[PDB]
Amino acid sequence: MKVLILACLVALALARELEELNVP
Amino acid sequence: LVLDQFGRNLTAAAMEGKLDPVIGREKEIERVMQVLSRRTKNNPVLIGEPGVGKTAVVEGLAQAIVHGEVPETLKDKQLYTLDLGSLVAGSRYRGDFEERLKKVLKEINTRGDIILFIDALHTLVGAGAAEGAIDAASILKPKLARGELQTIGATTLDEYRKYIEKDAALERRFQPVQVGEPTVEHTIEILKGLRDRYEAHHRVSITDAAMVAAATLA
Amino acid sequence: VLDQFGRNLTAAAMEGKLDPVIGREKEIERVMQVLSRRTKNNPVLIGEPGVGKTAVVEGLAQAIVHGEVPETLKDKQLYTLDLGSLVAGSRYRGDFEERLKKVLKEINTRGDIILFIDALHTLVGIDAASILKPLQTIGATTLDEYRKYIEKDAALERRFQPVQVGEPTVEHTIEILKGLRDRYEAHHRVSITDAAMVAAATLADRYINDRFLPDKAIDLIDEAGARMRIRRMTVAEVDDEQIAEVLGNWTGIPVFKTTRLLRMEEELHKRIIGQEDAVKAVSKAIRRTRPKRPSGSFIKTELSKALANFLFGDDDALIQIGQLTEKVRRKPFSVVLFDAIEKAHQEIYNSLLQVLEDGRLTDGQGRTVDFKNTVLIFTSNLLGFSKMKQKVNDELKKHFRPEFLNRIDDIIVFHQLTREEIIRMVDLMISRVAGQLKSKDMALVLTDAAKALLAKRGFDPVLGARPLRRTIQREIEDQLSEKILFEEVGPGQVVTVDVAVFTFT
Ligand SMILES: Nc1ncnc2c1ncn2[C@@H]1O[C@H](COP(=O)(O)OP(=O)(O)OP(=O)(O)O)[C@@H](O)[C@H]1O
Ligand SMILES: Nc1ncnc2c1ncn2[C@@H]1O[C@H](COP(=O)(O)OP(=O)(O)O)[C@@H](O)[C@H]1O
Ligand SMILES: Nc1ncnc2c1ncn2[C@@H]1O[C@H](COP(=O)(O)OP(=O)(O)O)[C@@H](O)[C@H]1O
Ligand SMILES: [Mg+2]
Q1: Chain B, 69-88: which have a CB under 8 Å from a chain C CB?
Q2: Where is this region: II (chain C)?
């Protein structure tokens, strides 16, 4: 009779640090 | 010239026989030529799954130009596969990337017989974008407006929506050409047209039974 | 300054530079109602990609220069704003922020500027959002991106009024094409017939299903006019024959481009064998259409398949059942088959019930799916002393209510299995394996005795004729797989299954 509602964990991460290209 | 140090002239490669024979796919080589002659949405981007011959359609377009099997408005055009890698390479200074791309676009407008081909058009987003520098996408987006830049593109179906589609500006200018995966019977005719390339590289003989088996078993 | 960023659509409307927007007078009127308001005075043209929502603002700018614009909107210079150009320049970073602020400082320096933003979601996900606070702005997103970005901000919904720009009908996009006729006639120097435009509107809705009405139809007219300019280089009258040639290269289908086609009855039975009277019964029911309700409604699986092939081209145009949303949005010209409706309870009577009354399902997905060219099919059925013939139809009347069985097109019955019908199914299933033997240069002939044995075994009408596929391969193919490996039968051999036990040469 019962239903278990589980819990779909989503993949959530902080924004990526980037590495820069230099122009002198 | 300016275009040889960045792009690869596919039309010159088709004169020297360095491009594979693109048999079949004719109804879409001539469809690319339809899209290049349109009012707006005149930039054919070849969308299709990886391997169906999107690069081969433009390589088959280059072979159609050198055979005189194109219209006179696309007669003796020079296809250039502008790779973004040679365009970014160098550029150890400022504007180096925008002026190397301005000199490409000035050379396209000066000679006026260049059909630009941007293979992997999704990679146009974020090319040469250096610190305090604008990528190759921001430089051309405008040129597309002026229509001073008929380009041919080639993305996958995933990376067409993932990028080129989104850009609403590009939408009214880029026209997705479905490059379909060929059938088995179409693939056998591709393999028959490619016998003499693979029979000469391996110095073997490829029977008709093998090519029917190659397309069926694959 | 706007003099070097974005196109002045009002100035382009004075010169006739904009393509004429024929139709759309109701949606342009709606946009003038929003711009005339005090609060929420910023339209967001919700449409689909290529629906004509930029043409509403192009048609708005043409309405400004005609004087058909309200007194709060007289001589408003309507600018689209080119994103990706206010970049064009690095001094160094923050450039696109600092340059966009200089544009907005000229907008409130003047007072007659209305910005159009063709992708309003791209400025949500200076951002302008702030300057919006008090510069009227027309946006244009899709309905997926309206519910993702614009409605999900209460600081962007107290000012952004949604305006619907719907997909035109097949009728309405013809006058779009007839209004745009002189642009595409003059661009290719080739006249385009009215028939071609009736074709390019009808055939684009029918066969292009990822693109939307206005564009799709214009894409066929533009490319057929372009095709005519090419082959006169290798007065020339783009026709309806020309549109099917161009759409035959878009879709890659053979040119069969319908009442004549609908004349099936014999134009079929490639996969349907037996069941002959139900095939003649679904002829006159599908041709009742030739509304917003599906093309056919019926209460067999193969029947559907061959109905998907004959009506809708593809064998894989049969959808066997979101769960039917965004997969009939993809193909709205599909036969929707409902497998074993007896084994589902009443929660399924909302995507087959309100679609015979509306044909549209608004949902939480974000699009209204179109059921007006589908063929809905339900698959329901597969005491004492005594001394189906024609009736199965009363079972489902007693099962669920006939408050929409007069809304079902036709409740057809299926007739009983025939001994000759199953023999005609045995030599149909031997074709699946005879082709695999002709790849070996073998030939598989059978006898009437052997074909009657396989008809006699595994045919049970409770299970339809499913048990027959097992009976072919357990008896023929398991004993034919061994004799190839035993090499009793090699290439260049005729195999004659006779006689009970199956034996051959
Ligand atoms: N019509 C054709 N005739 C002959 N060869 C073909 C044809 N189509 C594709 N090929 C060959 O198939 C191979 C792959 O084609 P191609 O590299 O153009 O595919 P693609 O879709 O552009 O691939 P990717 O997505 O990885 O860039 C090449 O050897 C190419 O020459
Ligand atoms: N009502 C209309 N009248 C005239 N042309 C139209 C109309 N609706 C769309 N079009 C044309 O169809 C194409 C649709 O482009 P656009 O309106 O920018 O699409 P979207 O609204 O999806 O961004 C353009 O060529 C446009 O001029
Ligand atoms: N006229 C026909 N009616 C029913 N089944 C058929 C017919 N012709 C062939 N068959 C075969 O009989 C089986 C039918 O089972 P199924 O696919 O569940 O559909 P249904 O029982 O509704 O006809 C399939 O293997 C199908 O290929
Ligand atoms: Mg490629």
Answers
A1: 69-73
A2: 238-382
